[PDB]
């Protein structure tokens, strides 16, 4: 599609002139930040960002690539180098330590330096590193963790846990030697390492004794509590302070959000991961944007400020399943959660960063026409005379081999919710990509997010901006009425 | 490999503290720019940048991903939205119009608005758009075009040409109707549309009459001149001004660079594209960094300043051939050309941008170990019990069906110069990717390169910084002694 207005050079010259006016008037905010917000698109590399822009644009009735995402409005951009100390193509755990603790680490370990060794419980002790969230709490700020995966997953675990094995969700996942050597399962670390004001996401089963029926799936033994120590970790967390509340559904969450007696909130919406947004039960399950709204409303009450971590954790899982429809629809919802927080916070006192922990081997090509579906076919058949989708994965479960016969997929099949795009190599799960990811920033000290940075830099910018340890001697003025003129 | 120094959190905390010190001390340069430099990595998307960082790092004796590229030192970063008006997965021609002219355009057309139509000669007239290079020349600056492809290719052509078909290199490539309707081949537009001080790259054959033996390959008919109008476009370009010089090899280039009688230089080093750097004859063929040095030295002589376009054009071609070794080695040389220009220019008076026109369907994964070759294998076998390379392409000539028998490639085979990584879909040539690309900037007005921008913004920033049309009323102070 050739939009007529774009045929005129005046359209492009005017757009560029307006962008130059925005750039020339752009001002940095030179105060500290009262609030610190980190939005993490799990697996949301640069290809995912563009494909999400096209999808969100088209859902809104536009052609796609021209339509800005909520993240595209952020004034400051940088590239983030994602490598783990031991692996150049990283995982979620090792990356979590970098952007949440400010120290690069080893693949599959959380909140520990690279002196630690994967699955070696004894290597934990003396090697723990502390999160910006932990440090925000020590400074008197309120702290929050919001995710679409289990709250015990690698990314949210990076804000509170210290483990040499990211698979240790409950005591049921641990070898006896690790339990005896003094290692704690992630679910236990969640309630005991530090005070967390807001915990929202999935992961009910790892918090309850073995056989405890799930409130949503009581008849399914696979959804039941799994704990071997018979501890009710939800009960133990509630008992820590006055004003705590536990919710497991959307109605309870909405009621809790309005309740003045509630000051701390734990909301666990599924036995493990939350349903993909497209499969969400709108009456039972809250959306990521709803969870972020409740989190901001509760955390906002503390006049000292807050640190908030929001994770679009299922973008990663959609890509692992080679199902681009799931990965991209999750990213659409992630972008809406960014928009909601923007409506509820001011850049004058809030530093908001948007980034990814790593990328995937996801790409879209085939010289597709303007305004066509991202899930569509390339305009020409491939060398074998059969069609090909714009989206293709390097590896994963989408690999097809009907003997030596490549399928000849239709537009109807390719746009299907459960369609797995073709891949070059078979794997039960598609792999991460090792390439750099974007960092978007808005608010006090956002101008420090520039150039090409090591991933661990994200944690240091946020700690510096909030005058948190090791930067208590920040030398920054408190937030006032300095804005971007954006 | 776990490097011992990286086990200590103090290493990471010190590195971040140093980066914060650089960021806090970073000062925008609020003057105009005397010199405007654009480095274009053709097809160099974000995956190519990282893979090139690892490769360049390892070639230098390091582990790889920790080692900065010359481009990684640029203070200002942004994302560029590459879509063509008619195609969301773009080509080199349509993108060239955006970052060189400041107007987005249609797929396969150069220096024309999207009112024009591909391969419709009549749609050219009244729809031409003018480059920042053309506008730099009008303002009295010296102008230069440096590329590793033929100088008549889509990207360099964007600085001087207006065509509805990027395949019109010479008159031999044109239909008779287009010639009769008044359309000009790219090679002719090169010498006639504007005055270009420095032209460096390939493309000898499109400049000479049919059958003119190539100076390097006289015995090969496939390397001979291709022109049907019997014009010698090199001779016509030399005759335009006093002090012009034509070179076709490295020794002649070096001699021309030092000759005070030479003020304009045309250097065409191959019949078509220049050899891939790994295949380069070091005595006969100049490197991209050498061409960049000669261009900067010659263009620097003008007290009014210069506009210079430098293109790592074979990065794209390596990826099209599904041969990552070629694509990445070209990008290594591209990064070295960035470094050379940095040594020869001052950020106080020079605005240098680095970007890509578009990306590819190239990626690298497989949870590879730190310090391993980018051309290596993933540490574990795939689901079918056979190995897999870290690098994989979505499509292209690397596809291997083999009656459903996926190869079980070795490290020796995968690291080979001509190895084509596996692909999901067969194509004679691998396709571009539609995702955003990076923009890196240094110098006066580099701080305007921020956030997420439309690709055509690159041309406007450069025109504004140089006080070129339509921004002659820039209101900027002249370059001074303020650095980043
Ligand atoms: C999204 O979340 C929804 C909210 O929880 C969830 O809805 C629940 O779904 C099931 C239907 O699959 C309901 O249980 C079945 O539905 C009937 C319940 O009505 C009942 O009427 C009887 C009248 O005397 C009485 O015996 C019964 O106790 C009363 N229940 C209630 C809750 O007031 C019943 O006819 C049916 O047999 C029962 N049994 C089966 C399948 O054997 C349940 O009520 C729903 N809860 C709510 C609040 O609506 C929904 O399924 C979930 N998923 C989707 C896709 O929407
Ligand atoms: C790489 O090229 C070297 C230089 O090539 C010579 O110079 C020009 C430059 O393009 C070219 O036109 C000629 O084909 C070539 N010919 C001649 C007669 O010099 C080649 O090296 C040699 O150059 C030396 C002087 O530097 C000369 O004495 C040699 O005779 C010439 N080699 C010959 C004639 O065989 C060199 O061969 C080449 N290397 C490879 C591997 O191709
Ligand atoms: C695949 O089906 C398409 C119809 O969309 C057809 O045009 C094409 O010829 C087919 N390719 C084959 C059967 O090789
Ligand atoms: C491929 O060769 C490797 C040797 O590295 C071997 O381990 C593997 O079993 C082979 N795969 C098959 C299926 O032949
Ligand atoms: O996101 N991860 O770290 C992750 C999870 C499951 C995997 O398989 C591979 C990587
Ligand atoms: O425009 N291009 O760079 C381009 C488009 C299709 C190709 O094949 C090769 C090159
Ligand atoms: Mg995660
Ligand atoms: Mg639920
Ligand atoms: Mg606001
Ligand atoms: Mg090109
Ligand atoms: Mg040569
Ligand atoms: Mg310099
Ligand atoms: Zn991840
Ligand atoms: Zn993952
Ligand atoms: Zn290109
Ligand atoms: Zn190309």
UniProtKB/Swiss-Prot annotation, chain A:
Cofactor binding annotation: Binds 1 Mg(2+) ion.
Sequence positions that bind Mg(2+): 42, 155, 311
Keyword Ribosomal protein applies: no
Subcellular location: Cell membrane
CDD domains in alphabetical order: ALP (cd16012)
EC number(s) on file: 3.1.3.1
Active-site residue list: 92
Cofactor(s) listed: Mg(2+); Zn(2+); Ca(2+)
A molecular function GO annotation: magnesium ion binding
Pfam families cross-referenced by the UniProt entry: Alk_phosphatase
GO cellular component: external side of plasma membrane; plasma membrane
PROSITE patterns, A to Z: ALKALINE_PHOSPHATASE
Disulfide-bonded cysteines: 121-183, 467-474
Residues involved in Zn(2+) 2 binding: 316, 320, 432
Enzyme class: hydrolase
GO biological process, any: cellular response to BMP stimulus
Oligomeric and partner information: Homodimer.
Role description: Alkaline phosphatase that can hydrolyze various phosphate compounds.
Anything else known: In most mammals there are four different isozymes: placental (ALPP), germ cell (ALPG), intestinal (ALPI) and tissue non-specific (liver/bone/kidney) (ALPL/TNAP). Rat has two genes for the intestinal isozyme.
Designated name of the protein: Intestinal-type alkaline phosphatase 1
Curated annotation (Swiss-Prot), chain B:
Protein name: Intestinal-type alkaline phosphatase 1
Record bears the keyword Zinc: yes
Membrane topology: Lipid-anchor; GPI-anchor
Quaternary assembly: Homodimer.
Co-factor remark: Binds 1 Mg(2+) ion. Binds 2 Zn(2+) ions.
Glycosylation sites: 122, 281, 408
Primary localisation category: membrane
GO biological process, one term: cellular response to BMP stimulus
Task of the protein: Alkaline phosphatase that can hydrolyze various phosphate compounds.
Name of the coding gene: Alpi
GO molecular function, one term: alkaline phosphatase activity
Matches recorded under PROSITE patterns: ALKALINE_PHOSPHATASE
Cysteine pairs bridged by disulfides in the record: 121-183, 467-474
Active site (record annotation): 92
Catalytic activity from the UniProt record: a phosphate monoester + H2O = an alcohol + phosphate
Record-linked InterPro entries: Alkaline_phosphatase (IPR001952), Alkaline_phosphatase_AS (IPR018299), Alkaline_phosphatase_core_sf (IPR017850)
